Every structure is written in C-alpha cells, then in structure tokens.
Amino acid sequence: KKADSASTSLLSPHLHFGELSVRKVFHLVRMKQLVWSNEGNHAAEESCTLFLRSIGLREYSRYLSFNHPSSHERPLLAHLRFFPWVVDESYFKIWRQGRTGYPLVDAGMRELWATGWLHDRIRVVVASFFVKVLQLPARWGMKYFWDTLLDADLESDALGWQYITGSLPDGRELDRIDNPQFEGYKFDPHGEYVRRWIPELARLPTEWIHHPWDAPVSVLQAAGIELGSNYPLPIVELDAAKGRLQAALSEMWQLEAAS
Amino acid sequence: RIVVWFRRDLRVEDNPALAAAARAGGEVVPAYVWSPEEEGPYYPGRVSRWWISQSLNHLDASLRRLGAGKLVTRRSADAAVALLQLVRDTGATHVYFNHLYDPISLVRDRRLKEMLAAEGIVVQSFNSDLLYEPWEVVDDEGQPFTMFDPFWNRCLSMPYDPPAPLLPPKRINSGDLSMCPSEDLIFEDESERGSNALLARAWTPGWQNADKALTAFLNGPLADYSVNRKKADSASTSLLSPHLHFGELSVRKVFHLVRMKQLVWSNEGNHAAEESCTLFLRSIGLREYSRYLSFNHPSSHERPLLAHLRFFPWVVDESYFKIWRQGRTGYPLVDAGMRELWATGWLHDRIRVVVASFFVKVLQLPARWGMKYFWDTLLDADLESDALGWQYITGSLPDGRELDRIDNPQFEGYKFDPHGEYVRRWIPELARLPTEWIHHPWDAPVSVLQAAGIELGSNYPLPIVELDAAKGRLQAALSEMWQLEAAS
Amino acid sequence: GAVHGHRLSTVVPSSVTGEVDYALADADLAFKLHYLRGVYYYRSGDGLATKVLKDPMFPWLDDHFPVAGRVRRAEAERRPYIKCNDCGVRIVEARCDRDMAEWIRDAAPGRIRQLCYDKVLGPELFFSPLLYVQITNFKCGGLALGFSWAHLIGDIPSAATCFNKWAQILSGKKPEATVLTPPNQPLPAAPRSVKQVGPMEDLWLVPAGRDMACYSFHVSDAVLKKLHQQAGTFELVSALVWQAVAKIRGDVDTVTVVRADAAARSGKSLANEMKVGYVESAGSSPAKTDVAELAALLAKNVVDETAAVAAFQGDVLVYGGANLTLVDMEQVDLYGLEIKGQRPVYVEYGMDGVGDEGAVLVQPDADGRGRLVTVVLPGDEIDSLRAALGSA
C-alpha cells in the first residue's frame, strides 16, 4: 500500500503490451513461495499470496470484459447515468496541473504527468478525489488517464474506475469521502512521498503535510508556506463536498425511483 | 585548572586547545558560552542555530566518553563575564581557546585576553581553522596578497607543510563538576521546532558525521572532482561545508588525507584523479583566503564590504524579494535552487552563484537583503566565506565576477545542469519540458510548452523580470552610479 | 526512571463526516468537568506495535465520529455541542525501563497519572481533543494503554464499551453497531447530590486547591466473605471505605453514589445515563458506624437524583463535589479489552476533575472474584487511610 518507496513490481506497462508472460510470472512466484515456506520465511511466503492476487485482478479484468462487456443497456458507469456532474473545465485543469491544494492529490498528479505511471493506491486517491470531491464527469478523468498512463489498459482501466465509483459489489462505498489523513497514513506515513514531488512542502511537519489548510498560521509560516501564493488553497473544501455529495446522490436516487 | 572554551571547533581530533589542556597535567574544564548578542548583525540565524543544538549535544557525549563530567553551557550577553564567572565558579588557573579570524571575534577576543589577564587568568590561543596563519603567508615585500591566485600559490609553496593533525586526548580529567551548573541553552523558537527538525532528512550535525562524510567523499566522488565539481545534478562535491564551518573537521586532516590520495593516484597513472585533488585543495584554499581577507583587509568605514556599489541605485521591492525566497521567479535554475535552499539548508556553490547573481543582476535588490536571507537559511552560514562569495559575485574583488554583465541562463544551465535533471528534481512541474528550453521556458513556442503541459502564468510562473529589461536597467543603474561616482 | 520520550500523533475517522452537529444531552453537559483515566496492562507487547494499534482506530472512529470532533457553543435567543470536524484523537507513544509487574505491585502514588496523558477540556477549549490514548512500552516487553477520556463525551460504560469495540476491530471480529441516531434535545434548585460552582468559561476543570492523588487497593474474595459474615458486594466495600474515610475527616454523613446500572441504559453508545443519588448517615456516625449497616444504608436508602442533575442549568461537579461519592462500575467489561488473544493482567481506572470531597471507584478484578477500588483523596489523606484500611 505504501507509495513512499518502490514497493510494487512496476511491471505495469510491460504486462499491458505482453512484453512479459504472466504465466512465467505465476510459475516463478509460486516457486519462490515454495522456497520461502521451506526457509521459515512466513511473511515472504504470505507476500507472494497477495502479489498473485494482484496478478489475478488483471485476470478478472479480462473475465469481466469477456463475460459482462458493456455497450448500451449497462455501459460502463451506467449506475450514475443520472448523476449531476459538475461541468467545470476550470476545475478539471486545476486537477490536471496538480494545483488542487490537496498534497497527496497534487503529488500524484505531478508524477502522473512526469513519469506516465502511478502507484495503485495513488491511482485511487487522485481518482476518488476527481469524482467525490470535485465531482466532475468520471468520463473526463478517464480520458486523461487514457492519455497519460503508459500502462493504459482497456479492461484494467475499466475495473479500476468501477472500483472507486462503487459501480459493482466489490467496489468502494459511494456516499463517503476519504479523509486525506486516512489516505496519508496508509499510503505515506512520513509524508515523504509528497515532499519528494512537492518540494514546496518540504518543511511542513508530517502532522499537517496531508492537510495544510488545517494548520495554524504560525506553523505554515515556520515552514515558509503561505496558502494561496506559495502552495494553493484547497480548491474545494471537504465539508462543502460531502454536502454536495448528498445533494447529488439523493437527487439521483430521486431520479432513480422515478423511472 | 584549565578551561577549554569551544566556539567553532566542535571536534575532539586536532583541537590544539583541548589537546594542550589535557597534556598540561592538571584538570580540564570544557565549556561553551552562548553569547550571540555580541555578534551584532551576524547573530546566528535560524537553521545555523539548529545545527549547534545538535552539534553540542553530539560533542557533549564525545567529551563525556573521554572522562568528562559535561560540557559546561553558559549563557550571557558578554562572553568575558560568563567566562570569568566560570573561571571563578569552577576556579581555574588558565583559559584555553582556539582563535578565530572574523572581524567580530578578532577584537572581542582581545578584549577577553586583557579582561581575563586582569583577574590573573593566563590565556593561550591556538590555530584550529587554517593550514597557515594569515600573517604567515605574504608576498616578496612582506605585504598581504590582494588576489587569490598569488596567495594560494604561496601556501602551496610555503617552506613547511601544514601541521599534521593532532591526536585526541587519551582521556580528559575534569574533576567534580557536579557543583558547576550549566545553563539550558535555547536555540529554537517553539514555533519553528517542527520544521527545523525536518533538516535532519538531509543532514546530521557532528564531529562523528563530519568524519564519515570526508571518507565518503575521499573514496567516492573525489576522483571525478576535476570534471564534475561544477555540476549540481549529481553529488559532485564533499558536502563538508557545515561540518567545516563549525570546525567539526580538521582542514589539516583533509589536506593531509587528500595529499596522500594524490600520491597513490599519481603512482597508479590516474592523472584525472590526481588533478581532482589539486582542484579540491584549491577549494579548501578558498576557505583559507576567506580568513586571509577578513584579517588583512577588514571591513572598515573608510571603505566597506560592497564599497564599489555605494551609489548603485538598487531596486527596493519587497514583492520581488518574496518571489525570490519562494522560488517563483520563473527562472527554473534559480527557482530550483531556492526550493532546495529552503528544504535542506544547503546549495551547491554554483547554484549559490546563480541565485545570488540573479538577485543583484536581474532583480537588482540590495545585496544586503540576500546576504541576510542566506544567513538565516544556510547550515554552513560562515561570516568570512559569505562575505567572500557576495564580494565575488558582485565584483568588489579584482578577482571577482564582472559587474556590467548578466549571465545567459543557458550558460548557467549547460555548465551546472546540462541535462536539466537539477531543475526536474526540484521543480517536478517542468519534468516533461525538454532540456532545450528547460532553463528559459519563456522562449519556447506555445506548441512545445503545451506538449510539456506548461502554461506560463498558471502552471509555472512567467519571468518576473525579463532579461532584456534587466540588462537595460543594469546599464541605466551603472551609468547612474558612474556619473555619481565622478561627482565626488 | 519515569516514563519517557513521548511522541504524539493523531488518528481520524476514515470517512470525512462533513457539516454535522452532534447535539449532546444535558446529562452529558452535567459531567462536563470530569475525566476518566483508564489504564490497561498487558503481559505482552508482542505483535502490538504502534501501527497495529493505530490502524483500527480509523474505522472505529467512523462508528464513533463525535469523539473525534471538538466542542463549540451555539448562541442563545449558550448551549455547547460537538462540531463534527474530524480533529481526531491524539495518541501518545512512550516507554518505561521499568518492569510492569514491578510497578503494579508497588502501591505507587500517581502511576495512573504517569501512563495516561495529562490534559482536559482546557484553555484551548475549541481545539482540545475529547480522547487521548497513550501507548507505554516497558523493558519487560509490557505495554500499558492509558486512555484519557472526557466524561462529557460519555459515561464509563460508554467509554469502556467503545474501547473494546476497538479491540474487537483490532483482532478481526465485528463489533455490534454503534447507536447514536436518536438525537439529544434539551429539557430548579441545586440538587444536593451535586455541587454548584461558579460560571466556568473555557477551561472545564475546577482547580481543587489541596492537591488530590490517586491510589488503589485489591480487596480479595476472602475479605469478600467476611464482608458477608458480619445489599451486595459493592455497597459493602463501598461502606468499608466510606467510614474508613470518615475516621480520616469525620464529616462524612452525606455521601452521594454513582451507579453504572445497565437496566437504565438507553442502548446508545455515546450517552450519559449513570444514576445519581444521595446517602445520609442520620442514625449515627459513619466513623461511629458498623460497616454492615452503612452497607445496608447504601442499598435501600438510595435517593434518585439523576433526572434532576441533568435538568440543572449551571456548572456542577458531582464526583467529589458535594459529598464523598462511591462508584458503581464493578460490572463494566474492563477485561474485555482483548488484543486479539491477550486480555489484560491488570486494569485500573482513575479520574481527575473531581472535587476535594474525593471519590472511590469500585470495579472488578482479573478473576471476577474480588474487586479493585481506586480512591481519589486529598493527598495527605492516603497516608492514614492506608493504615485505616490496613486493619480491614
């Protein structure tokens, strides 16, 4: 789950272009499991279990597209057909440039433009934020991912969005917005991920690094930060966004039971 | 019996004061007094204070492991007052310290000699900071040198070598200092402690870490120093400057260790590494020349630091100074360095040249302003070395850099950051901007800046001052200065 | 050799709650100046590193989001409420090169106060956490969890049953749901079981003046039945100390007593329905009383003042405010704090913010065989009561 280090395989774009046989990955990992088990390395043994599960998610990516493809009666994200999307090209551009004032969101949005790749958990942070905070058309941030991901994969992109929007029973809870400090603590305990991609925030102590707008002015200035000039103010506030979330979801469930 | 007064020699190896107190026979009381009010404008700045707080703790344990009760920490506004309370309180015969060379210490410390010699204390001062004493190196008429090349050429041809580094004491005897109290020193505002502690991401102050950084550089990037010393996109230099400012490392050990590496490399045919040592010692000699300048030609009133820029009409503009500190100038090489200076307390020497040259050539703000900011943000903020650097970049020295001239940012970029990887590390916004325009984005076509995802003015700032406006205003400011200068 | 190196962190609810006000009852506001200090001790610190203890707190505080809020005051036409902003609860990491076994069998003055964080609704009223958790490692490989919990948030059954839903979380079992969705709405003379004290501004702790101190004692099942051979257990070892304190100070004929009765409990997990009521020794001197009758006195001579304390408009202090007050909690799941398999070796609850009257909390032990009782006393007073109790 950590993004403050190279914790995952970074085989993502290779596997999309068939540059590496998943069957070879499977056989080699399974045999690594056997040696570690025999070496008393239980944690490492446990690790391959989860890594193969991540391989299986790519299998499930093709399963869902072969069995349950989507065109017209239930196209992808059909359940929010009736969602009141904020059509605001200004907010989209601010999300694109990583100028949203939410560090973990801005950090990952820089790396995405920089290296054409993002850690999975950061793939949800900037995506959950795009549809549950700024609440823009999910079809919009989909086309940005398509243009700026090297491992841009039709089925796996489909699965990943369906996951964060809650479009299928495995997915994530809809009327709910992740507190940034929850994200930060799971994906970035020492804030070193955004310090590396947002060197402006380097002096901000770890306690506030994922939510600078709640910091006392005395702390912001001690870190040489001045919200609005040095590092942006939160373009949309969380309270004003979960509020907007209820007003947009029941308006739609009202539209739902009306047809 | 003997007090050892620490100031900017927070080490235990090759420390002639402490090593002679221990070899006198009697006890040794090692102490440090924090008298910053005596430093006037050169009162230690924010992040330099954070270093001393760790360096002293670190030197405390070192001293205690060698048989000491403690390092006595005294507080005062006058060093003599606190020092002679201690000679009384702790009752000593002698006071030993290693003498500094800045204009403040030079006369404060001769007021201490007499002040202490009037209450019967014998005082002795030793050399802890220079290969050669400033009076030891002169020209053929016995005069000080005025340029760096003849001076360093002399040290390299001195009739004797720099004294070999002394060993540390076998152990030191302090007696019972359970009596003697130490004042809890305050180096950090409560408000700043949480951001000051993030400086440890990049640095670890201390005699012990200075020693590990030296053997890291000696066995690593020293061999390529001849060809890479100017680049800021790799760790090309020793990163020893804060350690050397606080005297946590001997320069006489560095000299001797480097001269041994050279002899071996010369016997291995490694000609490029052999010149690397020649050039790195020269950098050690620039630190020697900083002391040689502040001792032989001090700041006076008859002629101050930047005296050649007396009638220079500076731009006074607090807005510009704010943009410069925040690295939002719109010049990527400058912004990249201003971001790293704030985040780590350190800058490669050539990025110092870039950010300071930009300060007095493009924004043309009072050099004092930037000299003060440097003092609050640099971990190695060093009186004589900072003076020499600003004197060099403004052209007060005959050695120094031309006055009536602005660097093309591509000239700076190709010398210190040829692949743009320094800019891209510290300004990730411009990661996808090609090397060809990464140091002057304002010149790129819109298509190229749109491909790089850059909107000059929203994604990354516009040039706060354009080069051609800066050069026009520089000639108008110098002509204004030169018509004024003749009017006197 | 005290506990050292505190470094503090915050945890928040996993979901952001939003604009949301938690109205608190006037029974909640009645205890706004009292604070519970529960500490649980564990043989093993093994496998309970700080991230394993911290990680479950995020889902836990989505079920208990008002404890991660902070206090505000609405205007009148000033009653306080809980701002549903996720300030979170502060976690304090500390160690002690002590062996924990050594320290629990020490009868130490003020260890309750060393292993729980020292802070209350205080000068910074609007940014003061409602809950702190301090994780103290020992060189024994022991680990004590001291919880500093405001009584405004909840009673002690509420405090103790929410902390173990946390331990249910940690170990991988599913807690039974939180109940706070019937909102709290508002509603004479100073009730005698409580005590009036002057307008309390923004620091909700009454200074005691004469320095109060914690201490506690094991009363075993053997003395549990000489108790019998002389009204259930808690009001005879309540009676034991009530008079014991009475030969210490004398004017001890009034005493109020706090009840954690589950029969009056609403079912809602963030409440304040402990029941409050006077006791008076009219017949003869508690210091002159035989214990078996003041025990008999505290069972049927009980007086229900609970409804009236909440209806009090004004700041009051009930534990140790007016009379000495004994504590009814012996039936609170304190050894249900199961860290996956490990349930504690030792649990003791303290308090602060209780007036100079003192208070005694009567609560269970490891075996469910005897009781543990913590006594808040004017510190000069535990010198003698330990002698006073030593006979018993």
Ligand SMILES: Cc1cc2nc3c(=O)[nH]c(=O)nc-3n(C[C@H](O)[C@H](O)[C@H](O)COP(=O)(O)OP(=O)(O)OC[C@H]3O[C@@H](n4cnc5c(N)ncnc54)[C@H](O)[C@@H]3O)c2cc1C
């Ligand atoms: C909104 C969103 C969009 C995504 N878009 C893509 C995409 O275009 N292409 C893509 O390959 N993955 C996509 N993913 C899945 C996941 O984010 C990446 O596969 C993973 O982060 C790439 O890093 P890695 O190769 O080091 O992963 P590892 O941890 O090394 O996983 C091993 C391999 O398993 C596969 N995999 C792992 N997790 C997933 C997953 N959740 N879904 C599908 N396959 C997975 C990948 O091929 C990956 O290389 C998306 C996820 C989300 C939430």
Ligand SMILES: Cc1cc2nc3c(=O)[nH]c(=O)nc-3n(C[C@H](O)[C@H](O)[C@H](O)COP(=O)(O)OP(=O)(O)OC[C@H]3O[C@@H](n4cnc5c(N)ncnc54)[C@H](O)[C@@H]3O)c2cc1C
């Ligand atoms: C405007 C300006 C301000 C400066 N301010 C300082 C300052 O506050 N403190 C400071 O120590 N240096 C200062 N310098 C000098 C130089 O920038 C630093 O010495 C160097 O950047 C430190 O990095 P380093 O230790 O890796 O140097 P290296 O290249 O590894 O050199 C080894 C050592 O030689 C010494 N040295 C190298 N160059 C110089 C120099 N030009 N003048 C004096 N000593 C030198 C330092 O002690 C340094 O640690 C300044 C230069 C300029 C142009």
